[PDB]
């Protein structure tokens, strides 16, 4: 199926506590493979997946330089942002960045991303056509004009459709026996009386990969959306993921409710009934 490479970086200013903290991580699909941390001693891009170890010293040299360079420019961008928003240098602020590309089954390019967020909200982003920018506000528009003048978009576009998809293609091959993997969820149901006339039905999905999944409750064959509780998908820590959906039901009416599970690793969607 399709695949993605993504880089996430977070810069956090610490007034009266030294330089801003910079943390970058790299993902192929739902598997992390590298990290960088400006507060760590190594001061290098570190491997966080087995299949990336097989990269030579050059790779680690190049990647380390790029991510270190980026930390310094986002460091400065935090300064520049204070100016644009007329904010004091006594407060702490955040600069987030996502970058990456998507490829189909045939390894062909599908989509590219280059996005920034200041204090948790959109700042500037490269549109889907990778030709123009989306400025979120008055401040980001200043940057947008700069990036237009400096032709940043054409540079990033080429990199996304080229270097990125080529890098993604290589990573997949190297992480073949691990990234082409598709683990179906093990499902089960729990049941607990909330009181003398009500019980909780909780639908479980465990040990699946990738993380993408859909858990749905129906009552008498009809989606029971509003009344449901649905937790965020969570990492088990072993490379697989977990999730559950719960409904509060009248005691003795358990059989009316059905849980429906959709996942890439499943031949057909599952149905669970207590």
């Amino acid at each position: 199926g399709s695949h993605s490479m993504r880089y996430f970086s977070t810069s956090v200013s610490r007034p009266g506590r030294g330089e801003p903290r910079f943390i970058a991580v790299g993902y192929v699909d739902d598997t992390q493979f590298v990290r960088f941390d400006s507060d760590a001693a190594s001061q290098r891009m570190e491997p966080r997946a087995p299949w990336i170890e097989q990269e030579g010293p050059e790779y680690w040299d190049e990647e380390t330089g790029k991510v270190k360079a980026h930390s310094q420019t986002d460091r400065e961008n935090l300064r520049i942002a204070l100016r644009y928003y007329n904010q004091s240098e006594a407060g702490s602020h955040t600069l987030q960045m996502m970058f990456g590309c998507d490829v189909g089954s045939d390894g062909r390019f599908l989509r590219g991303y280059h996005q920034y967020a200041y204090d948790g909200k959109d700042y500037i982003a490269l549109k889907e056509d990778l030709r123009s920018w989306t400025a979120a506000d008055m401040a980001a528009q200043i940057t947008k004009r700069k990036w237009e003048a400096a032709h940043v978009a054409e540079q990033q576009r080429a990199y996304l459709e080229g270097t990125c998809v080529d890098g993604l293609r290589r990573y997949l091959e190297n992480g073949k026996e691990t990234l082409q993997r598709t683990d179906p969820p093990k499902t089960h149901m729990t049941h607990h009386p909330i009181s003398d006339h009500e019980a909780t039905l909780r639908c479980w999905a465990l040990g699946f990969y990738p993380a993408e999944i859909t858990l749905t409750w129906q009552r008498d064959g009809e989606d029971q959306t509003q009344d449901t509780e649905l937790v965020e998908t969570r990492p088990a820590g072993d490379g697989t993921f977990q999730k559950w959906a719960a409904v509060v039901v009248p005691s003795g009416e358990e059989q009316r409710y059905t849980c429906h599970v959709q996942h890439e690793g499943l031949p057909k969607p599952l149905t669970l009934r207590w």
């Binding site: 880089y7 990647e63 790029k66 420019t73 400065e76 520049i80 940057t143 990033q156 990199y159």
Partner: peptide
Amino acid sequence: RYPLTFGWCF
């Protein structure tokens, strides 16, 4: 491969 971020000046 980490992007080239030189021109990402705000």
